[PDB]
């Protein structure tokens, strides 16, 4: 299943201690420009109310029956579109997270995440930002691939 809307809201629950807020909020936002820009989606930030897409920055057990499991392992994961808990995006606070290296970098993470959130699974191209494995690669030339365009187009148009 997909968003049955075209304006879809997100909300950062709350802010993780490793980057300054201005930073976190520049990759969220900038990780769902990247769907918004090959996609008839548009994503609003709200600061009140209930949003479709809850990003959240939680360690080990936080209430949704998949704690996660300290640094390293597993760093993320996100619940397909749906209500109350669909959509949301979640990231492992034991992470390290940063604007660029040296930690799992927010952005990068964020649009794999938001790729589940807007229903995609994953990729064989490892190209592919819904490739399986995270890997930090250069943000400067940061693109789509083929295969994540194809996918996120084969639901939304
Ligand atoms: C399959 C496997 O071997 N499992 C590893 C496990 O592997 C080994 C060899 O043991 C390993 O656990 C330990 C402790 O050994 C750990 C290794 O990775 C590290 C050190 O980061 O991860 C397990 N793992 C993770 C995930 C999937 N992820 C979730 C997701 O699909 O998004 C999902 C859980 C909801 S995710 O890892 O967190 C993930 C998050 C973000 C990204 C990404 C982010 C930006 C750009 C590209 C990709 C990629 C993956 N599947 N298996
Ligand atoms: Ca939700
Ligand atoms: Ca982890
Ligand atoms: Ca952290
Ligand atoms: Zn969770
Ligand atoms: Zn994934």
Same mark, same amino acid.
């Given at each position: =299943?997909?968003? /049955?809307?075209? #304006?879809?809201? #997100? /909300? ?16 969220? /936002?900038?990780? &769902? *420009? ?6 008839? !989606? ?26 996660? $499991?300290?640094?390293?392992?597993? !760093?993320?994961?996100? &619940?397909?579109?749906?209500? %109350?808990?669909? %959509? $949301?995006?979640? +990231?492992?606070? $034991? ?11 927010? &952005?990068?993470?964020?649009?794999? *995440?938001?790729? @589940?959130?807007?229903?995609?699974? @994953?990729?064989? $191209? =490892?190209?592919?930002?819904? +490739?399986?494995? #995270? ?6 030339? &940061?693109? !789509? ?7 996120? *187009?084969? !639901?939304? %148009?």
């Amino acid at each position: =299943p997909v968003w /049955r809307k075209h #304006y879809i809201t #997100y /909300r950062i629950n709350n802010y993780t201690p490793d980057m300054n807020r201005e930073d976190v909020d520049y990759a969220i /936002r900038k990780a &769902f *420009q990247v769907w918004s820009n090959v996609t008839p !989606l548009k994503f609003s930030k709200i600061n009140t109310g209930m949003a479709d897409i809850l990003v959240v920055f939680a360690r080990g057990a936080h209430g949704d029956d998949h704690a996660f $499991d300290g640094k390293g392992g597993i !760093l993320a994961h996100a &619940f397909g579109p749906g209500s %109350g808990i669909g %959509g $949301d995006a979640h +990231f492992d606070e $034991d992470e390290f997270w940063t604007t660029h290296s040296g930690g799992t970098n927010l &952005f990068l993470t964020a649009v794999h *995440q938001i790729g @589940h959130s807007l229903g995609l699974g @994953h990729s064989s $191209d =490892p190209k592919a930002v819904m +490739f399986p494995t #995270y890997k930090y690669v250069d943000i400067n030339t &940061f693109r !789509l691939s083929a295969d994540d365009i194809r996918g996120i *187009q084969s !639901l939304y %148009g």
